[PDB]
């Protein structure tokens, strides 16, 4: 089957008393034993979907709670001047809990560890993590697209500001709309709009037709992640595009338009 069996794995959205509002899995070892995948596949996928444990219950963080956890992690790590290139769970967990004392702190050690396993890579020195900064930047940008430019467009300079304002002050990343290839289109060359690739036509002629209505000229790198799902012959993407559209290679940039 190749995937984890999430049948009994509940979604955690920051609730106060998770174990009572929830036939539970308590351990990742248990989940792997009951899953039709290898241990390495199961562990890797656990990290990508944001699997965690809360109140002894194996769970999966909701996308809203994962966003909030990453955001407070980044604010707190900058506020304590942690080394974003050498983070350990202990300092990071302490940094986020420092100013959460009078109420409910859902950001336990395991939640912190889930965020780091999703947005960071562990170094083969200590039990230490290095943030994947461009990946975090892209993930923020995707949230900004969905919130601000779902069904309407926005000038590029205004969008970049709203995108940048999600980061902690002094966060060491330069952002660039090219990070969001596969998640947006440019209705004009100075505006941007969100697009969800999952909702595009499964017929390639119809998909290219729809994409040229959104944007009459595409850089090949911009349209590629929106069409590659249909390239089942595995050919070079330029040859695939040439079957359904016109290409013109400029200097090094290829521009693609309808035929």
Residue numbers in the entry: 114 to 135, 142 to 243, 246 to 380
Give the article text:
While working on this complex, we also obtained crystals of the C‐terminal domain of Dcc1 (residues 90–380) that diffracted to 2 Å. Phase information for this crystal form was determined using multiple‐wavelength anomalous diffraction (MAD) of selenomethionine‐substituted protein. The refined structure was then used as a search model to determine the structure of the Ctf18C‐Dcc1‐Ctf8 heterotrimer by molecular replacement (MR). To identify whether any common domains were present in the heterotrimer, we performed a three‐dimensional homology search using the Dali server 48. The results indicated that Dcc1 contains three‐winged helix (WH) domains from residues 182–252, 253–317 and 318–380, which we have called WH1, WH2 and WH3, respectively. A large conserved basic patch was present on the surface of WH3. This suggested the domain could interact with DNA as basic residues are able to bind to the negatively charged backbone of DNA. A gel shift was observed with both ssDNA and dsDNA, suggesting Dcc1 could interact with both substrates. Mutation of K364, R367 or R380 reduced the affinity for both ssDNA and dsDNA, albeit weakly with K364, while the triple mutant K364A, R367A, R380A totally eliminated binding similar to the WH3 deletion. These residues are widely conserved and suggest that the binding site for ssDNA and dsDNA overlaps to some extent.
RFCCtf18 is a seven‐subunit complex formed of Ctf18, Rfc2‐5 and the stable Dcc1‐Ctf8 sub‐complex. The complex is required for activation of the intra‐S‐phase checkpoint and proper establishment of sister chromatid cohesion. RFCCtf18 is a variant replication factor C‐like complex, the basic function of which is to load or unload a DNA sliding clamp in an ATP‐dependent manner 19, 20. Previous studies have shown that Dcc1 and Ctf8 are able to form a stable sub‐complex in vitro and that the C‐terminus of Ctf18 is required for the interaction with the Dcc1‐Ctf8 sub‐complex 39.
